[PDB]
Amino acid sequence: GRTLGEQWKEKLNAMSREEFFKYRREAIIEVDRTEARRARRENNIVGGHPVSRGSAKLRWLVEKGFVSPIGKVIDLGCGRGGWSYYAATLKKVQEVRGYTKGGAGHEEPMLMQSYGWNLVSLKSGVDVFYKPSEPSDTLFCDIGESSPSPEVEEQRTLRVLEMTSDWLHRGPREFCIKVLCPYMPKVIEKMEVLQRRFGGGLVRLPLSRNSNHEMYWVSGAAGNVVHAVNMTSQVLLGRMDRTVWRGPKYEEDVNLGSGTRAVGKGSNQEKIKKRIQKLKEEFATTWHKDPEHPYRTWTYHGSYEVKATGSASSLVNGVVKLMSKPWDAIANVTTMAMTDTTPFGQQRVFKEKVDTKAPEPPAGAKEVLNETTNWLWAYLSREKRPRLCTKEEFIKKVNSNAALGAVFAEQNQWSTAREAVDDPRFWEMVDEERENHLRGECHTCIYNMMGKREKKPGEFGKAKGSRAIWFMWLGARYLEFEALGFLNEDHWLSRENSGGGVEGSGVQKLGYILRDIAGKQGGKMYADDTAGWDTRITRTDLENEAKVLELLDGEHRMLARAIIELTYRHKVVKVMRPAAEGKTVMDVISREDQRGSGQVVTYALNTFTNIAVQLVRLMEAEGVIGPQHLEQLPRKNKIAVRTWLFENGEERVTRMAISGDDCVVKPLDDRFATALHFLNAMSKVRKDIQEWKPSHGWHDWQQVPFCSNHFQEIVMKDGRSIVVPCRGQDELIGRARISPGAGWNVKDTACLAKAYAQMWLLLYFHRRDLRLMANAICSAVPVDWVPTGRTSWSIHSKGEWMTTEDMLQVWNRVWIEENEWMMDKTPITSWTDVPYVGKREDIWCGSLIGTRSRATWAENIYAAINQVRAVIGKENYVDYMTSLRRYE
Ligand SMILES: Nc1ncnc2c1ncn2[C@@H]1O[C@H](CSCC[C@H](N)C(=O)O)[C@@H](O)[C@H]1O
Ligand SMILES: [Zn+2]
Ligand SMILES: [Zn+2]
């Protein structure tokens, strides 16, 4: 009770609730929050309304010189993001990163479109007390949880000051740090030591309410700490006991405006000029060059107004949910959501993942890739001969529902792909562009880039933004397919031809292939994921892929050359973006590197390059090359590379399983784990691991991740063994619980549930919970109804369950009949003779067996089934529950 603050606190703690809320707002300045709250209600994130009162507080501080935010701003305990968004409106600020705890009983970051929103990056679920410090130019911290006990607040405050000191030690000359309880002795001492070392002073905002004693240690203040605090205490004490409460003085809230901001700094225009010109002309009406466009590594050409496209909804699948009551309690399943594919949705991912420049590899690294890719092209073409693909081939393999991909009104004459390929007028458009290509010109081959609708873990209690996919229109895709599609159609990256690849194989083959690799002598199995593979394909990588041309001649070569040079290298792309005031715009941008996700040969070229990368890593691992060769390759090891490849290559690729950017490799020893110098120089940086930390390997091949699964060997009842795919049961159920959009009627969602159920039966029958849930779903869905919808995006999903045939029959087809690693072709006649994984593995991968929630669920499954049957209604049903032992 010694300090005046302690007297204030004690008097505060003794107030009645009614008086507390009068005193709280007495004589303070308060921003009118009315309009902001209506904005929050009406989902208006483009009107300039700040997410909290925190924007006004920071505004007051900069308008008074107390802090002048600049450069890279770090914001500790950002909450909704109030400070972060205000900083981003400021000219001198170029980057904002917020961190915050989030979760139950804490504020999550809110996603806004305030001016400069593209400079901001908020992160939730972070405990900053144990987050390693990072360099920054401006540092913010608004952490400090109140308490009726000054002693508690004192210790909390100290913990923050102690924490911020680690961050101040790394440069920030600008700062603004909350000091929750400034009047307590140990805090006073800490402030004095900190002020000496880093400067600044303690300030009390007139925007703060009288119910706290918070002060801000800001870099552009100064003064005696003690004096400052006592002056605050006195004001506070003075405002107690009034005869008449006069209330606060009202101010207007800050208006943060809207729209993206330009990034600083940021030219083979010949080969793209026609395309741009044709677009500028077709959309001249509102065409313009936005000075505030957010592109940093893409070159920008212009923008025009368009109607926004995409969705931000996730809806629940009612039938799956009814059959999965125990998972209602699993956060991992219920916080999953469809990704946001609105333009704001994809753009907020675009600025992090796609607008990056992967550096070109250094000269020595190039020379080694050169020899490797020479070797690899030679090896792939040892037996196979390139060829044109035909119109008829295209028409037969085009999905009747492939994207049209119109980029010009002229390309938008058909309502489905099937109609286009059936219309002579389409092929006339193709021919016309074809003849242009033969003359080394390209007029209309242009990508649309948009958000991919995906089922993913949530973010800030809501949906994640979307991954960008891009592809050219049906006509351009035909031309690609004609020139380069032989790679696909004649299976140039099949295992038989590539050694390392796995083209064509369903998931059901993948485990067996991993096992075969395990049988070779060598070290641990590795499986490093490259972060954002397509965005890391360099000019060098493209130049090496371009060596297909040397396998081609005449007309065939010329067509292929146009695809490769005019279409894969000189890419022109159309992407939507949020403009100001709720309107959206189509940007036309370009760049020479990176790989477009929806090129006809993306998988092939990815597989090809990934094999070459692994070959290079193995050479560094086996000693042929090292860091001393990155800047220049000596003639002698340049030759060793050649001979290494020549003598070893064919064996070495058999130690790989390469599916696009997905890789598994069993090197000779474990020097591989530190063979990272070339890997990093080639820009193929590893995902989720410090740049130079060695790679983790596995001893058990059954724990190796490949194409989103790992694989388990299980011995069946009749003594035969199978290798099956296995993965987190939480997400499997999480995804089945999500419907692809709004407005889906009972029958359609029932048919999607039925596809998820049947995919489970065919691939994850060995997971106890799923087999029960699958039979339960199929028992609640009318037998006649036909499975519809996507259950996977993986190229290795072959969809055998998308059928009305009995699932046991198809089980035998893929697991016995067509399974080349199963000698004994003895058919399985009943489900009970189909194995499970060990309960140890089942539980490790999310199973709920042995739990009482599950028990209740299992025992009462029929009630669940009947609930769904009622909703669907009188129809023809069948009970499959009896195919499980416990229901006989
Ligand atoms: N240890 C911790 N690590 C990260 N965040 C924390 C934390 N302790 C508290 N927080 C969070 O930090 C936030 C401070 S309130 C932030 C207000 C913000 N300046 C604005 O204007 O919007 C709270 O939401 C709180 O949940
Ligand atoms: Zn073209
Ligand atoms: Zn598993």
Numbering used by the authors: 5 to 270, 274 to 895
Article passage:
Although MTase is common for viruses bearing a 5′ cap structure and RdRP is required for all RNA viruses, the flavivirus NS5 represents a unique natural fusion of these two important enzymes. Different from primer-dependent RdRPs such as poliovirus (PV) 3D, these polymerases contain a “priming element” that partially occupies the putative ds-RNA channel (also termed “front channel”) and is believed to play an important role in de novo initiation of the RNA synthesis.
With an aim to further the grip on NS5, we have crystallized the full-length JEV NS5 protein and solved a 2.6-Å resolution crystal structure. The structure was solved through comprehensive molecular replacement trials using multiple search models derived from the flavivirus MTase and RdRP crystal structures. The unit cell contains three NS5 hexamers (trimer of dimers) in the H3 space group, and the asymmetric unit comprises a NS5 dimer with the two molecules arranged in a pseudo two-fold symmetry. The MTase (residues 1–266) is complexed with the S-adenosyl-L-homocysteine (SAH), the demethylated form of SAM. Unlike previously reported RdRP structures, the RdRP region of NS5 is intact, with motifs F and G completely resolved. Mediated by the linker, the MTase domain is attached to the backside of the RdRP through key hydrophobic interactions (details below), shielding the top-right rim of NTP entry channel. Although quite some polar/electrostatic interactions are present in the interface, the heart of the interactions is the formation of a hydrophobic network. This involves residues Pro113, Leu115, and Trp121 from the MTase, and Phe467 (ring) Phe351 (index/βNLS core helix), and Pro585 (middle) from the RdRP fingers domain arranged in an alternating fashion. In the JEV NS5 structure, the Zn2+ bound to the pinky finger (Zn-1) has equivalent coordination partners (E440-H444-C449-C452) as previously observed, likely playing structural roles.
